[PDB]
Structure formats: C-alpha cells, structure tokens
Amino acid sequence: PQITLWKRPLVTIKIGGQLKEALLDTGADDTVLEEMSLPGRWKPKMIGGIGGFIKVRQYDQILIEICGHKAIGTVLVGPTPVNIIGRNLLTQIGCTLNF
Amino acid sequence: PQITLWKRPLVTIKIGGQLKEALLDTGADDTVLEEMSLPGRWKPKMIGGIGGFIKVRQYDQILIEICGHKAIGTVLVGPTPVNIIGRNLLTQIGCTLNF
Numbered sequence: 001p002q003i004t005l006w007k008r009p010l011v012t013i014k015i016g017g018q019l020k021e022a023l024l025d026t027g028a029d030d031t032v033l034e035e036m037s038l039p040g041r042w043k044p045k046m047i048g049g050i051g052g053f054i055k056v057r058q059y060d061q062i063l064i065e066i067c068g069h070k071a072i073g074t075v076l077v078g079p080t081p082v083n084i085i086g087r088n089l090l091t092q093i094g095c096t097l098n099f
Numbered sequence: 100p101q102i103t104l105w106k107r108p109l110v111t112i113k114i115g116g117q118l119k120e121a122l123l124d125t126g127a128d129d130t131v132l133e134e135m136s137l138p139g140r141w142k143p144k145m146i147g148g149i150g151g152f153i154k155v156r157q158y159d160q161i162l163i164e165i166c167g168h169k170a171i172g173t174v175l176v177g178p179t180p181v182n183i184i185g186r187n188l189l190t191q192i193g194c195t196l197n198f
C-alpha cells in the first residue's frame with residue numbers, strides 16, 4: 001500500500017495470534033510495544049525518545065505480522081504512548097519513504 | 100527521493116536562514132526542533148512522546164525548506180534530543196510510506 005500522512009499512520013498488526021494497532025514510525029530505530037507477554041527470555045535495553053529515556057524489555061526473534069506482511073525480529077516492551085513499528089521491522093516488510 | 104530505512108532518514112532542512120540536519124518521522128504529529136530563535140509570536144505547548152512530555156514553544160506559519168521542498172506550518176522548539184520533521188510538514192512535501 002501507499003500511506004499518506006494526513007492522519008496517524010496506524011495499521012493493524014498481529015502478534016501471538018492477537019490483533020493490535022501500531023504506529024508506523026520512521027523516526028524510531030526500534031519497535032516498541034505496550035505491556036504484553038512474549039515467549040522466551042528478555043534482556044535489558046534503554047531507549048530515548050523526545051521526553052527522555054525509558055527502560056524496556058528486549059525480546060529477539062519475535063514473529064509479527066504488520067499490515068499483512070510477515071516479519072521476525074526484535075520487539076521491545078515497555079511504557080510507550082502507542083505500539084510503535086520502527087525501522088528494524090519497517091525494513092523487513094520493504095517500507096520506504098517517498099516524496 | 101526514495102529513502103530506504105536501513106538507517107535513520109536524516110535530511111538537510113533550511114529554516115530562519117540556517118541549514119540544519121533533521122529526522123523525517125512519520126510517527127510525529129508535529130515538527131519539533133532543538134532550541135533556536137524564530138520570528139513572530141509563540142505560545143507554550145506540552146507534547147508527549149517516548150519518555151513522557153516536554154514543554155515547547157509553538158510558532159505558526161513558519162516556512163521551512165526540506166530537501167529543496169518548501170513547506171509552511173507550525174514549528175515547535177524545545178528540548179528535543181534531535182530535530183524532527185513530523186506529519187504536519189511531511190504532508191506538504193507529499194511524503195508517503197510505501198510497501
């Protein structure tokens with residue numbers, strides 16, 4: 001698809017058989033999801049946004065479908081205003097910025 | 100321009116006669132720049148992101164050049180860790196996400 005930016009670029013994702021809404025965010029290095037359970041072990045990560053740093057749980061090799069497109073990679077879980085799909089997964093589904 | 104997302108989508112902008120580097124961010128509602136002076140009236144605003152909220156100064160009807168493309172709109176100025184071009188100006192240069 002081609003997504004214009006007049007509205008927030010919110011898509012449906014699927015993770016652990018659950019549908020969720022997520023923001024496609026080209027300013028994010030990483031993908032950050034609201035509190036949920038994921039399989040396997042996690043490792044600690046600190047990430048920075050406009051309001052400062054947050055502590056998140058890093059889960060590697062997580063299956064996630066984004067607007068119909070399969071991706072498998074790192075997902076961080078922590079206090080975030082919205083589920084964010086960052087460049088690590090935007091690259092996997094073939095996403096570019098065009099103007 | 101077609102921009103891949105392997106790396107941070109950083110572009111050159113021109114604002115108030117100054118050349119600056121800025122992040123194209125499809126997740127930001129608003130454009131927010133690190134501290135600088137801008138002409139005209141401003142009002143205080145609070146904006147949220149990862150890490151919580153920051154206080155910014157809001158300047159309307161500001162002209163910016165983004166990779167050669169002229170855009171006018173609201174520019175916020177405050178303690179952001181990076182210059183961010185958000186959707187309010189990305190729409191004006193006809194920027195889309197494609198996959």
Ligand SMILES: CCC[C@@]1(CCc2ccccc2)CC(O)=C([C@H](CC)c2cccc(NS(=O)(=O)c3ccc(C(F)(F)F)cn3)c2)C(=O)O1
Binds near residue numbers: 146
């Ligand atoms: C996962 C980190 C995300 C990011 C990284 C910025 C960065 C880059 C390189 C180095 C250091 C830091 C990019 C980003 O889009 C935001 C948020 C949206 C998630 C953001 C950016 C710009 C402005 C706002 N505030 S706002 O009022 O314009 C706004 C508020 C809420 C939302 C919502 F959709 F997320 F809800 C979007 N925009 C928020 C942020 O806070 O940091």
